[PDB]
Amino acid sequence: VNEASVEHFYSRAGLVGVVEVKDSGTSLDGYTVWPIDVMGFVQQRRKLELSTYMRFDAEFTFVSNLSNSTTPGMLLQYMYVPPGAPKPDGRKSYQWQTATNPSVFAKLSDPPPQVSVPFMSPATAYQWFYDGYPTLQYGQCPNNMMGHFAIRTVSESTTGKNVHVRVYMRIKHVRAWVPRPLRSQAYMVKNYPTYSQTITNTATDRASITT
Amino acid sequence: VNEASVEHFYSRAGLVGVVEVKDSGTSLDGYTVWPIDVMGFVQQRRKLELSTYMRFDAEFTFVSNLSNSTTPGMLLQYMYVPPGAPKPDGRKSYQWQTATNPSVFAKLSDPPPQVSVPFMSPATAYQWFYDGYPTLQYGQCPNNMMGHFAIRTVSESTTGKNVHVRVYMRIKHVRAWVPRPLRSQAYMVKNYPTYSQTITNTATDRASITT
Amino acid sequence: NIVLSYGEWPEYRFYTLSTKSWKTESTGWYWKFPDVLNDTGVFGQNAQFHYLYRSGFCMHVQCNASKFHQGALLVAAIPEFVIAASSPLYPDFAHTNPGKDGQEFRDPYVLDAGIPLSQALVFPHQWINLRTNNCATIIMPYVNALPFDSALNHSNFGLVVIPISPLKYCNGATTEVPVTLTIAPLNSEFSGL
Amino acid sequence: NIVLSYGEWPEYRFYTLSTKSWKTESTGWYWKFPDVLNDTGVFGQNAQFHYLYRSGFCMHVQCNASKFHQGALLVAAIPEFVIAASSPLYPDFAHTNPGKDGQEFRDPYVLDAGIPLSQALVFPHQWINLRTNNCATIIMPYVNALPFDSALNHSNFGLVVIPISPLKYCNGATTEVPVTLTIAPLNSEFSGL
Amino acid sequence: PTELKPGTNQFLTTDDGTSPPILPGFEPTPLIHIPGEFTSLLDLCQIETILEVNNIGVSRLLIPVRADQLCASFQVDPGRNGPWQSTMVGQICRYYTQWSGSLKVTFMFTGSFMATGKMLIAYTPPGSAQPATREAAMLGTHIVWDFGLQSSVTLVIPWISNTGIVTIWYQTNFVVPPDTPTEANIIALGAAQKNFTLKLCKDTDEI
Amino acid sequence: PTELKPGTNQFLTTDDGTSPPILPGFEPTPLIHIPGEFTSLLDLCQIETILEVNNIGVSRLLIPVRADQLCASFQVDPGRNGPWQSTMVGQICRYYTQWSGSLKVTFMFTGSFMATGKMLIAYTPPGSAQPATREAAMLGTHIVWDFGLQSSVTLVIPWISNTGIVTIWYQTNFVVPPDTPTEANIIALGAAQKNFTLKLCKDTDEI
Amino acid sequence: EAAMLGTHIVWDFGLQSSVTLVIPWISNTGIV
């Protein structure tokens, strides 16, 4: 009864993204910018597309460690660049100091940080299916973007160790609108519906209709 | 009075299993899957068989350390694969990312993690004695299985250290049904009643019945 | 009888589009509209001049065939209906805004959305079974995330007519069966002239 | 007097099985049943055809012997009674479903369950002491984890009769003592024909 | 100030809790009424959707009828595979582990208005093997459905917990006047009943 | 916010606490009535179970009677060893350290209906040595039990805290008509009383 | 066993020395 519900069907934390700062090797950057995308994995893309419209709050958790699993104390900054704000160029860029970008300072020895992101869209609800041109652009609604998370180790110059991060998002206070079928065809491109020319059948074949 | 009770007779935490991830040696796996079994030790098998039917909640605690007892900070994942879900193939398998398998991220420097597992059976209560064929299969009821715990260190490739885990389960909110004798004969095979052909006597011998 | 989409009345004249011939081999059609009426009528001039509008619709599909013809049609109204481009990528503008004369499905089975047609019954729908009934009627309230939007850019919903069971007739009968559509705007509003 | 197992009445005709001869050397018997009546009677055809059933039983053991015979029997009803296979492994199907003619214990001392016979008095039981009384009666309610189950696959309980104290008689007396069993199903139900 | 820390301390269980908001004072856009809200996944099951009984394209949804034979048969289990794999009820059952309840099936005869005939629609319990003759199929649960009188009929499968068989038998023959097409079709529509329920959770193997 | 951490902090004591559920929203299968529930281990003691007085198989449960001698004797302590090791009361006393209360013993004469005789059943306090003659055994606690009149008798051992001796003496002789078997048996049934109690805990050495 | 399923009475000597079986209606033949 209550175990199948739109509130309970979109519930538990799941892995949205996997990022790496990687300043050790030929890549000396020491920072990364990760756009917030709920559809990055095809199985969570398919569940969110059971609804045309959704309105929810987000819960982000950052599980971070080095490559050998050891978590020595070292200081990281998790910033949040809301939609419409410029993204850092480098580790020393002045765009890490902006007071309107909320940031979290937490060591790798601490429990994983977590924060809540309110509903960001100008429209009443996120719409995963948009028909028409907003202004290649067919079906592309700019209202959905939730912003970015920029992550860097706080250091003067070039620490030689790579940091692996895993982001866990949890949908909260979810409301859904008009129902929609579940996709039969395999996804191809990230943003669009386009499907391969070889149509695969929904139901599996048998010898004859008798049995 | 209250010190001998079915609630108080099955009570305190006890050692259900001892597992090792062992990625250091010729075994490079770095993960292990442990099926939840309350009867793994013969003395807790004998106490649970004082009842035919039981219904209870579980409490699992994971005490983990390296081989030399030192517990350096390193990140482990304890997942839980409920009955009916596929088990990880390897350390990098995609079955660690499934959102419906609850998992716990806790370092070796932390207090031991603990979680609670609800009553999982389709039947009203677990039945430790089943008569008849469900479909070798004699007395084998599939309804009892509680699932698995898959454990791995979170790392990119091959950390060279072995981790020893000890699992402590605690029976909660226990209800029991029709009483049964306590086994006299020694156990042989894990699942079945089968007993050795040499019958050992319950009461110890004396010279004569006079004294 | 009347089908009321999503149990809402569209609270806040009849346009007869040209007839389609449904031959035994035809694969179906979709009109995808606020759009069908943009280029026709007095409703079509309002849609050009005003910068925002809110409107519901009432649409009526009717099929003229004898008692010796047989077949069936599924008539559905699908909100935010988005067309996909089958690989060997983007759909052409003729497909994404077919006009008043509609477009004919390339793949009726996936509805060119990648979603299966078996489950298309989750949307507001009717059946035309040539023995049972010749007509289907659907009232569609205004569904959008915003209270107002643009008529030229955004298409609120499509209307889709798939011949699920092919048309059969004995020799001598009329080869094609006319299928005609009638749209009456309900409770339309405009702003920003 | 009557023994009511576990204080429950089985709320929601008489079948006389063939007679067993209890000789001085016999080791006892077990009928293990929903099963005894599967192959006999009108109850046996219901158990084949319906896919689920719920039933309680009433069973009556009676022993005909003179005043010069002596001995004793323990009569118990044991739920979920599971047979074990003694090493020099699985019990054969003849042992796990003995039928209407019952099976004879290999080891009466452990009841072939590995559990001791001394403590078998924890189950619903009676004594037949040939001087005191010739009969024992037990009413068994339906015990299961589920409200319904299958008659062919699952056996709810066994019935076990062990000659604890061997039979003795002087020369000239009848060598064997007949032991007969009578089963009346109480409050049986069926579904899924 | 006297607190102490038990064994459950300081780990991520990936299950519910509370967290501080990242932007305080941010006021999100207010709600408006949108139609078509659905609060449950048990009302998406109850709506009948075509089930694919023929194993070819859109022809896979239809069983043909031509002029005491078995027309078609299919099993009643939504979860596993086969026809129910194209229904909505069978696609959401792949997200859960265990479903229990009663089902529903509907047939529509698509042939001509002038055509007359009769069919036999039988159901078999989960334990039994399917009937090998229509006379054996008649003694069980069945409905005798006459085309000319009624164009659609409904068979309700009784309780089933997580499998039965539905067999369609020609009775009599498919009778047509002159100048009427001799072949027709039937579409089958499956749906959950009101008492259907879903349990545990799982990750679909469809994607 | 002012809290501080005392010396009891952050260890596993393997004793009671609370923990978060691993699956929220999971609804387990509801309860139904099952008969035969037992909430205590003191009511499993009160039920009489055969105790093994003869040291051979099922013959170990019986004391023979044949045609002023001591038939048999056994000590009354459930915990240690011997006859009480086969009772239910003596198997649960191996899980605890200390038991205190009163016991009960019952005898059943299995011989023929035509046989007549008499016995003497005596009990000795824990400090005394057992009687060497039936006349010394008579002066203490005893019951004189006549077969032909009564087939079963009960001896209640008074309070004992965590040991007495029960001795059975032939009085008179075992008298039988012609054509009646000359040997008989007696089974002994031990059980706890209503005031029996169990203390501490331990791990059985039986397994 | 075939005779048991029909009409029968099980008569114990030691308890009772005489028993009665009533044949139901017959019009002008059964077997005992």
Author numbering:
A (entry chain A), B (entry chain A): 75 to 209, 219 to 294
C (entry chain B), D (entry chain B): 30 to 41, 62 to 137, 146 to 250
E (entry chain C), F (entry chain C): 3 to 57, 62 to 73, 78 to 172, 189 to 233
G (entry chain C): 145 to 172, 189 to 192
Q: Mind quoting what the paper says about this structure?
A:
Although highly effective vaccines exist for EV71, no vaccine is available for the global public health threats imposed by CVA6, which underscores the critical need for developing an effective vaccine. Here, we demonstrate the isolation of two stable CVA6 particles with excellent natural antigenicity: one empty (CVA6 procapsid) and the other infectious (CVA6 A-particle). The capsid structures of CVA6 procapsid and A-particle at near atomic (~3 Å) resolution both closely resemble those of the uncoating intermediates of other enteroviruses.
The top band exhibited a λ260/λ280 absorbance ratio of 0.71, and the particles in that band sedimented with a coefficient of 84S, had a capsid protein composition consistent with the presence of VP0, VP1, and VP3 in sodium dodecyl supfate–polyacrylamide gel electrophoresis (SDS–PAGE) gel electrophoresis (lane 2), and showed an absence of packaged genome as verified by negative stain electron microscopy. These characteristics are all consistent with this band being composed of purified procasids. A total of 10,749 procapsid and 7152 A-particle images were extracted and subjected to three-dimensional (3D) reconstruction, respectively, yielding final density maps at estimated resolutions of 3.3 and 3.1 Å. The obvious difference between two density maps is the density of genomic RNA, which is present in A-particles but absent in procapsids. Atomic models of their biological protomers (VP0 + VP1 + VP3 for the procapsid and VP1 + VP2 + VP3 for the A-particle) were built manually and subsequently refined by Phenix. The structural similarity between the two atomic models was deemed quite high as judged by their superposition and confirmed by an r.m.s.d. value of 0.4 Å between the two models. Though the procapsid was shown by SDS–PAGE to contain VP0 (containing the sequences of VP2 and VP4), only the VP0 sequence corresponding to VP2 is well resolved in the density map and hence successfully modeled, indicating the one corresponding to VP4 is flexible as that in previously reported EV71 procapsid.
